[PDB]
Protein: Pyridine nucleotide-disulfide oxidoreductase-like protein
Organism: Myceliophthora thermophila
Amino acid sequence: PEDLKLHQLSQKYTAEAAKRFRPEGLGQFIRLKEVGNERFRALAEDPWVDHAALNAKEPVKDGSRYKFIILGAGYGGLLYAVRLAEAGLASGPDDILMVDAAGGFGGTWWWNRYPGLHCDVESYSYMPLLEETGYIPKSKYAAGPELLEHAYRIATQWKLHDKALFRSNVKTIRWDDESRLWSLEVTEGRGPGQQSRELKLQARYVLLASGILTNPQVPKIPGLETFTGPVFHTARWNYDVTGGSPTDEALNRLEGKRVGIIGTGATAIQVVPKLAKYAKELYVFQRTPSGVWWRGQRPTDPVEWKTKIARKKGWQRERMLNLDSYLTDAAEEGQENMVADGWTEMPAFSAVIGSPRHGIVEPTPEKIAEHLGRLYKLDLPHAEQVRARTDSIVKDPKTAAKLKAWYPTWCKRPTFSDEYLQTFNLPNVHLVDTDGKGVDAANPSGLVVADKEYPLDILVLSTGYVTPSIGGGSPAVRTGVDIYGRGGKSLDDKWQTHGAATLHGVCSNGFPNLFFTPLSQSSQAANNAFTLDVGTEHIVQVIKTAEDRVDGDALVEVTSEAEEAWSFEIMKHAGWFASVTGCTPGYITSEGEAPMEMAKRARSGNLSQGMASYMKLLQEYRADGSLKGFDISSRA
Ligand SMILES: Cc1cc2nc3c(=O)[nH]c(=O)nc-3n(C[C@H](O)[C@H](O)[C@H](O)COP(=O)(O)OP(=O)(O)OC[C@H]3O[C@@H](n4cnc5c(N)ncnc54)[C@H](O)[C@@H]3O)c2cc1C
């Protein structure tokens, strides 16, 4: 048939995926902060921190003790802090220390302030604690500054300003069997030509909200060190080079200049138009095009607000559920599509998120093939619309051809823009495709691709971050710390040797009083704030329960039995994620790197049924205070 014929599409998809097989896998990238050359490393530094201001506050003392240490002061760590405060667990003045390498609150929204930055999920669904702060976002999609200001709004509202230690890198988290406390080894930056302070900090509990897209990377492009013009990563934007500011997109200092951008991910989609407006020439260096769908940015309407958004108590959680029902292929028949944007048009995104509607995939080759066939057929209509949209906007057919993405929607993060594609209709903008191969080399005046050379004045690296999957999902690797628990046992060694092991994705046996936002062995939503909502609430509620059961000062530790049962649960769901086999490389296959070694690998994945289902499971689990599978006792 016609329908079945059209899957020679999956022949174009495997050809385009093959084109970019790299035998090195993740080995092609290096963290900015680990590059040999010091000039280069310095690109990872915080451009925004006011060291004078921070250096004048009372310093945190070496040997300080707290009830809770939270690693991370972005939306995730803020949610933990707010939840602890509302649970009645953090009333005392040393009950919370938040620690972050950033110079202030916001995480993602502290570091990234490049021109054009917006959240890609609806503001009303994404910004935390809207109902509790009373804040009304200005638009459908929030810009950086509004996002950062909201982080400040939260910290202000819950009086967190004097409970944070910034500019600080955590290196080690070590449990002490004797005193029953975690010790953190921390290095606090004090500004240029000042000595850093080495700190040892102790806590009863450590809560990690260390994030997932945290460590800007660059590709190992031969001779990149040697390019002599100004270079910067989008995650550490250089407004001195560019002109403008976080709240001024007039990039006056690009006028007359020849600007290069490596990468075509969400960041490039947002930045490219802003660069085109100012630069004399803009060269865009592409290895894999994004599928660019429509955005539909809109100012908030005050009638729509009280009628259709803030509809009642608890409205935001209901809205987040509504949005995610489209992405988990679960929207019921005549339900209201509350968000009604481009995310609600991609039901094959469930390939990578889960769905509660289709059962569990049995792990026979016939059942996997049927699952994949189903998902490929589900995706076909949206995927063909994305290519057609590109076809219609981009006037030159050669450039249109290169901008078309040929992979299932689920293989990369979808991107949304009403200006990016149109930007390539401008005369000063040149797409440089690398045929799946990437940039070849650099030299003092610019880059080389297939022996042609492209001279540049200013180079922008929109080459992304260390994958969220790093270290098979090890919470240690992902946060960039060594974690040692009972008997000096290393979290990461356990993870690598025995496989992923948690209960509900948030704790591990041997590591009492440590919790982490769930990544491995849980579920995820496109809307990360939803995940953080669910996960921070579960963690704080488990701790609340345990504290209440011992009448303050608990020691809470999942058993090996309970984590191992949960891990066999996760293995049962692994067939869902055969969906990822056919993917073009990207952070979701760990650039293609993702016997019974297979079941060890399977342990690091997720439930297959979506966020709502995981959430409900946690609610039922907490309901009777039993904390089944935890060893609870008095810490003192
Ligand atoms: C450019 C960009 C745009 C995005 N847009 C969206 C979106 O629209 N919707 C969405 O759902 N998601 C988006 N994301 C994903 C985003 O990371 C999450 O939505 C969210 O901001 C994460 O909150 P968090 O507090 O968990 O992590 P983060 O915001 O990453 O904060 C964690 C902080 O902890 C710090 N930290 C980590 N390790 C250490 C250590 N060892 N020592 C000290 N400090 C450390 C980090 O430096 C960082 O400051 C985006 C990500 C990026 C990078």
Remarks:
- Residues 315 and 330 are 19 Å apart (CA to CA).
- Residues 223-465 form one domain.
- The chain is about 35% helix and 15% strand.
